[PDB]
Design a protein around this nucleic acid. Structure first.
Lengths: 235, 493, 82, 159
RNA sequence: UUUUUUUACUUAUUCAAUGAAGCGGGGCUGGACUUGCGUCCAACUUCUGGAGUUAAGG
RNA sequence: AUGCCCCGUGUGGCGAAAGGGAAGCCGGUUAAUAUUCCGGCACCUGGAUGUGGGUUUUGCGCGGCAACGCAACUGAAC
């Protein structure tokens, strides 16, 4: 049985009666200047009209197609420094024995990275597939790449994560990667990936790449817009 | 002649709270607890808590400022920060997805899970904590209890099974030193477990060993605090084991076979290279059954100097002839809910009693199927009023209860005026005993009256202290009288 | 023996009680001759007539998660898990 | 390994160091087969099992077991060592001088009243005239008469 | 596709307030009109020179 | 107590031998200083830690209508 001496005392938080309870005031925090600046920078880029050469970068690969590409790319990740050092030591042992470097070593197959290198490969038409990072800052380093790939006939895709590409190439950040040539057993997988990239990405973005971006308003301004549209429809 | 503020000087500088100590040392609480446990830092209590902290509580813990500064100068802090940074690098490698770099960083991270060893080197910590070997020997009770408990206990995330196995190796080496030097003198069996007291270099060490059973892990227990204490005690036990083996001349560590440990020989598995308690059970071969605890019996018999001891092959290996048909077995210890004339069937309680008393008690009282005499604790020192079971109730008893028992055994002016009116109108021994009881009652009344006069003459605070002492003594005498009364009941039965 | 001493639980009347005392195992078995945890461990180690009854009485051990058939490599796995 | 005590120089202990409280040695009660006078009643067993935790003065009950195989292990043997761990680094350590004296030492020594006789010892006269409380009494300077006052408002003189 | 007029939007820019504390859109409750259920408008403290804080409770 | 919680109020220093401010008086003494030295008799501030008192076995003292009195009279944040 409950103690009779325990009673409930409700607190009425109306205007001018009780001290207001501690609520979540995260929406109204006076943030530091760098946080405020990055938020308003994103907002300003949303509000202004974005020309098509930049607004084409909003459309990226979906999750399934990105994972399907990375399944091929992780087989062709480049050598790390330790693996390279081990390869040099094993080849040095064979040369110490007198055997040939052609005999002990074989043609490597890796994902090609580096911006100037990848651009050169695209111009020389050695690139089979080109993946361009979403968030390169400054954007002028990559803003010509889709048009260059369309000119050269190389299939391409814009993919989320320069950090994701840097993790492939054992760096912090890669702006662009290219597959040029694969081993014999992965040729079918590469062809299937290229066809899937074409049908999923390029056919979808052919209409929307020429359109201007931006023009999106804020939440309150949008709600005012549907309120005035509803009033106009009622009138 | 400068004016001084109140909170600046004195006990305020002398003591600091645990919160302020943690914030000064720039540490997390688990790291601060590990450092305090290893260095031996303990809170202490100030004379006036309000002098130290203005908003202070009976709950809060103060520390010594020089202790906190000594923790600041401790070099294990750099190891803690290095291990934190290395753990961050390992997590970075695992997130980025290269496993070779993560393993290469783990082999520098020096995990206790893979090593079976404490993560940091505590050698210098042992050195300031115990400056002398006799101090190290004095502080061994908690060490041995901890390490035997974690030899028995299951492994967890905090306590690796390899580290448990290393605890087992260290305690077995310590046991082999004990049976080699015959350093044990006292052995006790209790509901808690087995209490062992050994005198190593003149220092008495008593520790508890739990019975071999599934130890309950119910409730809330932190194995991380337990793991910190275990790591410290493993380092201390390893170093004291090495010093004891070097003093005895045997090689340390004793080599133990992995196959023999897998078979379960344990003490027999560990073999030590050469480079009155001994007389008790000096020349006798004893066999052990399944119910008997094989490693405590083997330990106590080897400590007593038994040349050969055998037990069942299912229990363990590396023993004498396991067959009971073997005529070499002089005695057999079995506790079951055969019949060899050579074999004397005797109890483990007899083994404990004989190693306690050095008397070689007869096996007739300790025959199987017969009630054994009650077991006695050798650690108890008799004192006046603390009561002794060995002492006779006739020897120790209060006079009132003695006369009451005597009266029970025997049973098993106004009066003069009434006699004058009446005339005008074995049993003597019982009456004399009643008169003696009445004289005792009147003597107690006189003593109580004198006590009341002295109590009245006492001052107020002295009166309250005197009443508290009388209350405590009355509680002690009440427990003693209850024990004596029900012992009298047992004697009557 | 280490697994029995570490993680030993008895399945009696649809309950999961630990094998704290040998009296519980004695009350559980009774007539088969198993009255001690050491006797149960011996009957587990060396196959006997009451091996099936002992396996039925003993609960399945719930090993801790470590961070084809093996001839003798199961000991390392059991040591790592327990 | 190597032993730490290569060179042992005797160092005086600092007065600030307070050694930890050592656990008491086991008594005759702790044994699994104690003398029978330590055993409690079933009423005492029920008294503890109804009693709350930490209200009991002693952490173990007097138990007698015939067989070592019938002896059960504690369900809190890990818990008591855990408490010992927490007491080693968490419990404050105090240097306290506890009094160990005979309680009768504080009592003053008083002469017996037989040395200090004469004094009044027994009531010999009762004066009964007041129905209320007798407030005041006084004795005539010649020692013959008694004057009493009461709640009845009547002052009386007695022999 | 460009040249003038006014006429909406907010993100440039300007002004003000705060300890950046309750903005906007819904939901609940009540009242009104309406249409036969959409709007707008309100939730909470007014005889007193007291006190209001460490959450009660489910 | 490998973290969590609370609070808003801002921002440091210099700036008065007449403002604010802890506490020393009398007598004597030197060629020359004196509320500074000597003698006598005090006070304030800060600190540590005992003894005696007070409170308490129902934990946090009693009295007066009251103004209030009594050697003490549990008191953290806010």
């Amino acid at each position: 049985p409950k103690n009779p001496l325990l009673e409930k005392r409700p607190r009425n938080f109306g205007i001018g009666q009780d001290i207001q309870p501690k609520r979540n005031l995260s929406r109204m925090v006076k943030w530091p200047e760098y946080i405020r600046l990055q938020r308003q920078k994103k907002i300003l880029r949303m509000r202004l009209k974005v020309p098509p050469a930049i607004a084409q970068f909003q459309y990226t690969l979906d999750k399934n197609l990105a994972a399907q590409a990375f399944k091929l790319l992780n087989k062709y990740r480049p050598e790390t420094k330790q693996e390279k050092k081990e390869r040099l030591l094993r080849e040095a042992t064979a040369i110490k024995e007198g055997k040939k470097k052609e005999d002990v070593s074989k043609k490597p197959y890796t994902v090609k990275y580096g911006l100037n290198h990848v651009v050169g490969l695209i111009e020389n038409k050695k690139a089979s597939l080109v993946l361009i990072a979403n968030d390169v800052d400054p954007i002028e380093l990559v803003v010509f790449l889709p048009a260059l790939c369309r000119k050269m006939g190389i299939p391409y895709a814009i993919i989320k994560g320069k950090a994701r590409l840097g993790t492939l190439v054992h760096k912090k950040t890669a702006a662009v990667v290219a597959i040029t040539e694969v081993r014999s057993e992965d040729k079918n997988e590469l062809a299937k990936l290229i066809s899937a990239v074409k049908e999923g990405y390029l056919e979808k973005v052919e209409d929307t790449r020429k359109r201007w971006g931006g023009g999106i308003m804020g939440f309150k301004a949008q709600k005012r817009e549907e309120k005035r549209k509803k009033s106009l429809e009622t009138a | 002649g400068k004016a001084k503020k109140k909170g600046k000087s004195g006990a305020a500088r002398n003591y600091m709270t645990r919160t302020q100590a943690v914030k000064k040392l720039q540490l997390s609480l688990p790291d601060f607890r590990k450092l305090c446990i290893w260095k031996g830092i303990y809170p202490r209590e100030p004379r006036d808590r309000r002098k130290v902290n203005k908003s202070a509580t009976a709950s809060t813990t103060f520390y010594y400022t020089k202790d906190i500064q000594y923790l600041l100068h401790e070099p294990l802090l750099q190891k803690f920060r290095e291990q934190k940074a290395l753990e961050k690098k390992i997590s970075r490698a695992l997130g980025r997805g290269d496993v070779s770099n993560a393993a290469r960083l783990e082999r520098n991270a020096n995990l206790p899970e893979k090593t079976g060893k404490p993560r940091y080197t505590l050698n210098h910590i042992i050195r300031e904590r115990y400056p002398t070997f006799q101090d190290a020997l004095r502080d061994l009770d908690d060490c041995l209890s901890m390490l035997f408990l974690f030899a028995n206990l299951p492994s967890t995330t905090a306590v690796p099974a390899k580290m448990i196995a290393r605890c087992e190796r260290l305690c077995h080496e310590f046991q082999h030193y004990l049976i080699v030097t015959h350093s044990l003198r006292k052995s006790f069996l209790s509901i808690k477990g087995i209490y062992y007291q050994a005198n190593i270099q003149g220092e008495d060490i008593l520790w508890l060993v739990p019975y071999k059973f599934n130890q309950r892990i119910v409730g809330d227990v932190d194995f991380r605090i337990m793991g910190t204490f275990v790591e410290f005690y493993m380092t201390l036990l390893g170093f004291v084991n090495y010093r004891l083996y070097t003093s005895i001349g045997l090689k340390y560590p004793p080599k133990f076979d992995q196959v023999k440990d897998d078979q379960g020989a344990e003490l027999a598995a560990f073999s030590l290279e050469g480079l009155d308690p001994s007389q008790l059970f000096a020349n006798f071969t004893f066999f052990l059954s399944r119910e008997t605890p094989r490693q405590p019996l083997e330990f106590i018999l080897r400590a007593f100097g038994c040349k050969r001891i055998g037990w069942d092959a299912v229990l363990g290996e590396g023993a004498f002839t396991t067959d009971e048909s073997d005529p070499r077995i002089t005695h057999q210890i079995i506790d079951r809910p055969g019949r060899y004339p050579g074999r004397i069937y005797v109890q483990p309680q007899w083994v404990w009693d004989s190693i306690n008393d050095e008397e070689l008690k007869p096996p007739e009282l300790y025959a199987p199927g017969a009630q054994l005499p009650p077991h006695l604790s050798p650690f108890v020192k008799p004192t006046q009023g603390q009561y002794d079971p060995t002492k006779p109730l006739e020897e120790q008893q209060t006079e009132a209860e003695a006369l009451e028992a005597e009266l029970e055994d025997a049973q098993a002016e106004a009066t003069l005026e009434r006699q004058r009116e009446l005339e005008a109108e074995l049993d003597p021994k019982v009456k004399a005993k009643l008169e003696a009881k009445k004289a005792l009652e009147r003597k107690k009344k006189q003593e109580a009256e004198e006590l009341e006069r002295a109590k009245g003459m006492l001052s107020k605070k002295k009166r309250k202290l005197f009443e508290q002492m009388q209350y405590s003594n009355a509680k002690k005498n009440a427990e003693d009288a209850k024990l004596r009364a029900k012992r009298r009941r047992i004697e009557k039965e | 023996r280490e697994l029995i001493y570490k993680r030993g639980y008895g399945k009696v009347n649809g309950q999961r009680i630990p094998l704290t005392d040998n009296a519980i195992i004695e009350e559980n078995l009774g007539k088969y001759g198993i009255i001690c945890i050491e006797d149960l461990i011996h009957e587990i180690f060396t196959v006997g007539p009451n091996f099936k009854q002992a396996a039925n009485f003993l609960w399945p051990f719930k090993l801790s998660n470590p961070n084809g058939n093996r001839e003798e490599h199961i000991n390392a796995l059991i040591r790592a898990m327990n | 390994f190597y032993d730490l005590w290569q060179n042992e120089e005797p160092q005086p202990p600092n007065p600030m160091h307070i050694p930890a409280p050592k656990l008491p040695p086991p008594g005759y009660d702790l044994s699994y087969n104690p003398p029978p006078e330590y055993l409690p009643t079933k009423e005492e067993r029920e008294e503890w099992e109804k009693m709350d935790p930490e209200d009991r003065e002693k952490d173990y009950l007097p138990t007698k077991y015939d067989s070592l195989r019938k002896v059960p292990a504690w369900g809190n043997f890990v818990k008591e060592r855990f408490e010992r761990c927490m007491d080693l680094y968490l419990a404050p350590r105090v240097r306290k001088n506890r009094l160990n004296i005979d309680p009768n030492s504080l009592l003053p020594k008083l002469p017996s009243p037989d040395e200090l006789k004469p004094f009044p010892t027994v009531q010999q006269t009762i004066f009964r005239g007041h129905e209320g409380r007798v407030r005041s009494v006084a004795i005539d300077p010649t020692g013959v008469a008694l004057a009493t006052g009461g709640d009845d408002g009547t002052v009386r003189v007695w022999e």
